[PDB]
Design a protein around this ligand. Structure first.
Ligand SMILES: CNCCN1C[C@H]2C[C@@H](C1)CN(C(=O)[C@H](C)N1CC[C@H](NS(=O)(=O)c3ccc4cc(Cl)ccc4c3)C1=O)C2
Ligand SMILES: [Ca+2]
Lengths: 53, 234
C-alpha cells in the first residue's frame, strides 16, 4: 500500500497519483488548504456536512 | 426503510421528497445544489404532476424548515428501460433556488476513480427515506436512515432472479431484517468519509423488501458523473 492506497495519501477528500507522488483535491465548494491536503468550505452550508444550525 | 433509525435534527439534510397533487410522498431524491435534485427515472411514471419538498422529518407536524419547490425541467436518461431498470436516473431543475438552512443542504458529488477505489470499498453506505417500514406496511410519517453494507458483486449476481447491469450495485443484508422499501425509490445512498457525505447511489429496486437471500439494488452513480455534470449545465 503506497501513495493513495496508504491512508488516502493523507488527503481530506480526493487523492490521485502523479509521477510517483500524491496530489490531493476537494469537492465543489471547498478550497484546498495551504498544506495541500485539507479541504476548507468556501461558504455557508457546504456540501456533505450535517447541519448544526 | 425497514429497520434502521430516525434521522435526528440535521442528520439527513440532503433528503428530498417527490409529492403528488394530494401532497403525498411517492419517491425520494437527493439535493445536489440550489437548483438540482437527483432521482430515479422510474419514479417519473408514478404521478401526473408533482413538486419537491425539502427540510421535512415528520409529515404530521410543522417543524419550521419545510419548503416546497416547483419543477421547471425534467431530465430523464434517454437509455432508461422499464424492462430491466437499466439507466434508472434522472435530474430535476427547480423553478426557484433552495435556501440552505438547518435540515436543508446538498450532498457532495465525488470524482469517479476515487469513489470506486475508496468510497465503494468502505464497509457501509447509508440509505434514507419516507418509504414503508415493512414489505406490506404503510409509508413512514418519519424520515428514517439505515447503514447498509456494500455487497460482493458476484454474490449479488448469484442471489438475483433478474439481470444486474454495469449501471447497478447491491447493498444490504442476506437475512437481517433491514432494507429500503416501497416509496424509498429515487432517494439517497451516501457514503461517509472523514465526516463528509458523498452521493454513491440511487434507491432503485428489490425482490420485495428485506427478504432472505435478496439484497437492495441501487443505481451506480459513479458511472453517471459526466452525465450528471452535463445535465446540471442545461
Ligand atoms: C415485475 N418484476 C419483473 C422483473 N423486474 C422488472 C422491472 C425491472 C426490475 C426487474 C425491477 N422491477 C421490479 O418490479 C422489482 C423486481 N420489484 C418487485 C417489487 C419491488 N417493489 S418495492 O416497492 O417492493 C421496492 C422498490 C424499490 C426498492 C429498492 C431497494 Cl434498494 C430495495 C427494495 C425495494 C423494493 C421491485 O422493485 C421492475
Ligand atoms: Ca414536517
Amino acid at each position: 500500500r503506497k501513495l493513495c492506497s496508504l491512508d488516502n495519501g493523507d488527503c481530506d477528500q480526493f487523492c490521485h497519483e502523479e509521477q510517483n507522488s500524491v496530489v490531493c483535491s476537494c469537492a465543489r465548494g471547498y478550497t484546498l488548504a495551504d498544506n495541500g491536503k485539507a479541504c476548507i468550505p468556501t461558504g455557508p452550508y457546504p456540501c456533505g456536512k450535517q447541519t448544526l444550525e | 426503510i425497514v429497520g434502521g433509525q430516525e434521522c435526528k435534527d440535521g442528520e439527513c439534510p440532503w433528503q428530498a421528497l417527490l409529492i403528488n397533487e394530494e401532497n403525498e410522498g411517492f419517491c425520494g431524491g437527493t439535493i445536489l445544489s440550489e437548483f438540482y435534485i437527483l432521482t430515479a427515472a422510474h419514479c417519473l411514471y408514478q404521478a401526473k404532476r408533482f413538486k419537491v419538498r425539502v427540510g421535512d422529518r415528520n409529515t404530521e407536524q410543522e417543524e419550521g424548515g419545510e419548503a416546497v419547490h416547483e419543477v421547471e425541467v425534467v431530465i430523464k436518461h434517454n437509455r432508461f428501460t422499464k424492462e430491466t431498470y437499466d439507466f434508472d436516473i434522472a435530474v430535476l431543475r427547480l423553478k426557484t433556488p433552495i435556501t440552505f438552512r438547518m435540515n436543508v443542504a446538498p450532498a457532495c458529488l465525488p470524482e469517479r476513480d476515487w469513489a470506486e477505489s475508496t468510497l465503494m470499498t468502505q464497509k457501509t453506505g447509508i440509505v434514507s427515506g419516507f418509504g414503508r417500514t415493512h414489505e406490506k406496511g404503510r409509508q413512514s410519517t418519519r424520515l428514517k436512515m439505515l447503514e447498509v453494507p456494500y455487497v460482493d458483486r458476484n454474490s449479488c449476481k448469484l442471489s438475483s432472479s433478474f439481470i444486474i447491469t454495469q449501471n447497478m450495485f447491491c447493498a444490504g443484508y442476506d437475512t437481517k431484517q433491514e432494507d429500503a422499501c416501497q416509496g424509498d425509490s429515487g432517494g439517497p445512498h451516501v457514503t461517509r468519509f472523514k465526516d463528509t457525505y458523498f452521493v454513491t447511489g440511487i434507491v432503485s429496486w428489490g425482490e420485495g423488501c428485506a427478504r432472505k437471500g435478496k439484497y437492495g439494488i441501487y443505481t451506480k452513480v459513479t458511472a453517471f458523473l459526466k452525465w450528471i455534470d452535463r445535465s446540471m449545465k442545461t
